[PDB]
Amino acid sequence: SMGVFTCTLADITSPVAPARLFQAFTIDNHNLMPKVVPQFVKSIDFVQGDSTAVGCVKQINFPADAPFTYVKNRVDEIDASKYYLKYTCIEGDAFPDTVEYAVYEDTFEQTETGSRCKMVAHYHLKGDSVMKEEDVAPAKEGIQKMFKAVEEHLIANPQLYA
Ligand SMILES: C/C(=C/CNc1ncnc2c1ncn2[C@@H]1O[C@H](CO)[C@@H](O)[C@H]1O)CO
User: Fold this and answer.
1) How far apart, in Å, are the Cα atoms of 95 and each of 86, 88, 152?
2) How many domains does the chain have?
3) Signal peptide location in the record (predicted)?
4) Which of these, 13, 21, 50, 65, is most buried using a 10 Å CB contact count?
5) Atom of ligand 1 nearest to the CA of 29
6) Could you tell me how many helices (H) and strands (E) the chain has, helices first?
């Protein structure tokens, strides 16, 4: 309608190897996140499929603390060799009134320090949808805290996903 707003929701350099972060955040997150970050993720259930694969749909349920309750993410592309996953949010109440359609790319890049993790969002905006930094700042701050906890978990458990 009005256009597309592409923004980097997270850009995080980490000493942890990219293959381990990729597994933690995009492949095995339905197991890891409710345990390691339960203050951000209540549960993650498969509503289509039973493993992270192209075509599966995961429902992420947020704690009662949260200002919303759930999203459903449909996985559309995986390139594990490049630590890349693209998914589309097809349903949920985490949507601002401004966003008609949301597409996400999780990418992990090998560096010298370790990894660089980028999470990019593509927001298709409704008819004249004003979008402000304040609309994405809580996502940015929440993702950084979640990454912090997951990073520490992988440091404390060096063989997990290794
Ligand atoms: C109202 C409001 C709510 C807060 N939003 C979010 N909080 C946490 N993670 C999010 C969010 N949106 C998209 N993600 C993707 O979740 C995966 C795991 O992190 C990554 O792909 C992230 O890119 C602020 O705008």
Assistant:
1) 18, 13, 30
2) 1
3) none
4) 21
5) 18
6) 3, 7
Q: How far is the C-alpha of 129 from the C-alpha of 113, rounded, in Å?
A: 39
- Asked if 57 and 46 count as a contact pair (C-beta separation under 8 A), the reply is yes
Question: Method used for this model?
Answer: X-ray
Amino acid occupying residue 3: G
Please give the distance, rounded to the nearest whole angstrom, from the Cα atom of residue 124 to the centre of ligand 1.
16
Q: Are 91 and 98 in contact (CB under 8 A)?
A: no
CA distance 49 to 9: 27
Name all residues whose Cβ lies below 6 A of ligand 1. Answer: 9, 67, 94, 104, 106, 119, 135-136, 138-139, 142-143, 146
Ligand 1 center–CA 143 separation, angstroms: 6
